[PDB]
Each structure stands twice: as C-alpha cells, then as structure tokens.
Amino acid sequence: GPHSLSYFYTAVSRPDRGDSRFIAVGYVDDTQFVRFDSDAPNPREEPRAPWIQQEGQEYWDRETQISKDNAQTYRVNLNNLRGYYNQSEAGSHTFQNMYGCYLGPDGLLLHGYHQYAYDGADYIALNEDLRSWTAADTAAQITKRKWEASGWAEQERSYLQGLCVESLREYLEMGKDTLQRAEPPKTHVTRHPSSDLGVTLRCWALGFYPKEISLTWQREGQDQSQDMELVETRPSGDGTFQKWAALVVPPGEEQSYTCHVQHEGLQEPLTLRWD
Amino acid sequence: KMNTQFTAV
C-alpha cells in the first residue's frame, strides 16, 4: 500500500538534571533511517540506514539544526504542560509527537497527519484539512487557541504537502532496492509433542518485509484463531521481521491442519502442513 | 526531512 515518511519525537523532563531529553527518529514505511538524541555535548542528526548515508553535509546540517531547535521547543512544552495540569516539579513527564505523509498514486500527498500525547494520553491533532486542530482535553483547548493565533498550521500544511512528500520520494529512490521490494517470508512448521494428549504445531514466517502479514491455522479449512497463540510481529535485526502462530492438536491428527501464510512478497499465499 | 516546530503548547 501507500508509502509513508514519519517521524516520532519523544521528550522527557528530567527534574534531577535540571533539563529535558529529546529523541527523534525517522522512518520510511517500516524502516528506521535517522535519529537524534539531545543527551550529548555536541548532538548531530545521524544516519540509521545504509542508504541515507550518501546525503551531503547540507542535509545533515539542516536536520541537526531542526533537532536542536526542537529540543528547545519541547523543553518549553514540558514546562507549559506541567503548568496546565498544575503538576509537581518533582516528577518526570513525557510528551510525544508523531507526524508524517503518505504518498498517493499521482505522487502527491494522499494523507498527512500530525499529533501529540502527554504521559501517553492523546493531547492534540491536526485535522484532515491540515489547517486546523482538534483538542482531546482542556489544556489542549488552550493550546489550540494559541496555535490558531500563531497560524503555524498553514506552514505544517505546506510541509506535509511539499517537503514531506518530496523527501519521501527521494528516500524511496535512494533505498529502492529494499524500500520498494517486498521480501517474502521464509517459512516452516515445527512440531513439539507437548502433552500426553497434545502436539504443538508452530508455523513460522522469518525475514519478511514489510511488516504486514497474515498467519492463520485451519482444521480442514475451518479457521482456528480462537485457539491459536499468535506472537506480536518482531524485528529480525536486519531490517526484516518475524512472526509465528502455534496451536495444540490431538495426537495423530496433524494431517487435519494447515497454516496459511499471506504476505505481499509471495508469488502466491502458502498453505503449509506438518508433513 | 523533518518539519520545523517552534510554537510551544
């Protein structure tokens, strides 16, 4: 489906250090490619994917300066939130922001988003028109009025329809051989005689990209989801992902069951059995 | 490439 570029900012206050820490990571689809961490004497934006590293000095300088500016804006945001909620200066709090753009079939913005959370609760979000805000709570209603007076949503709209889409297009080209290639899962079924009267069959999908996958078990074509254990999809460590789904079947009845693997990298969905 | 954010909450 549609490709996207997104960033994820996490700011935490640190009353004991008298400061705040600001971390920002960027992703194209399911692939991280940049980071910034404010907790260094001379912090710089840094590459976290091999294909971004060819960017010139001017790319790195711009991103580093945005990050330094963000670290200050989020330091102030943490103090303003503490004030809105009349919270103690004793405690650490967390403010997160995520925003990004999805690319449409004509190479223009399909959908842009931009939103925040404080201590994990929704705070404020940019609307569909990209020119206005929806507040989740009362403090964010005061933020909303200040931001309408600022008018900065016009410049965020400009970014999401412009630079966000234009840079995503560039990253897709630079990393095309991984970012625009669906890597199919390598699969197998294992068997673990478990119980006096049960055998565990586990259906694995290893090394797949992107993250979206469907693993299901059937008994003679009938879905077994209510009885299967399905683990959360997890990174392989090389930029791909893994997942498994297991279920206990009666002894001697392995031939009655199939695992169905559906992933965009496959030529065809797989039907696997313990053979 | 990142957006520019200067407007505190």
Partner: protein, 97 residues
C-alpha cells in the same frame, strides 16, 4: 502506565555451533524509562540497544541485540526492569520460540 511485553529469540533458526544473532524485543510499555539486559548464564552481556521509538498507540518499543553462537549448554535470557513491574521480568530464550 503500561507494562512491557518481552520476546527473546534468534534471528535465524538456531543450530548449535552456527553464528547467529540473539534479540530481546520489548514493546507496549509507557513511560519510556526501562532497563533491558540480555544475560548469558545469568551474567549481563554487552549488547546494542535500538533508538527509542513508539507505535501508533504511543507505547514504546526497543530491540536489544547481539551476535551469539548458540550451543547445547549456554543459557540465555532477557531481564527487564520497568516501574510497572514489581520484580524484574526474566524471559528465558529457547530455540523453539
């Protein structure tokens, strides 16, 4: 305040004597302060930790990982401390999960 889910696993199906990579994936937690250690026979390994990131529901995820050569005797685990956990959570590695 949400506790971490923990998975410990190898990159490739484990085979004794074959170099591989050992992963501890910790997800679903809030707030983000957390201590994640891979342990080898109960002692801390010096691993690498991914940059802090989060899901659409705002919960955090981290990957701690290192090279290893699995064998018949060495035991591995991942130990996680977080304010939502009364005691450290320890998940043992086994090559079937």
């Amino acid at each position: 305040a949400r506790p971490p889910k923990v998975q410990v696993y190898s990159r490739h199906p484990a085979e004794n004597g074959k170099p591989n990579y050992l992963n501890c994936y910790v997800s679903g937690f809030h707030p983000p302060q957390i201590e994640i250690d891979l342990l080898k026979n109960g002692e801390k390994m010096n691993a690498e930790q991914s940059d802090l990131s989060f899901s659409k529901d705002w919960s955090f995820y981290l990957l701690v990982h290192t090279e290893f050569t699995p064998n018949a005797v060495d035991q591995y685990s991942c130990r996680v401390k977080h304010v939502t956990l009364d005691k450290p959570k320890i998940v043992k590695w086994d090559r079937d999960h």
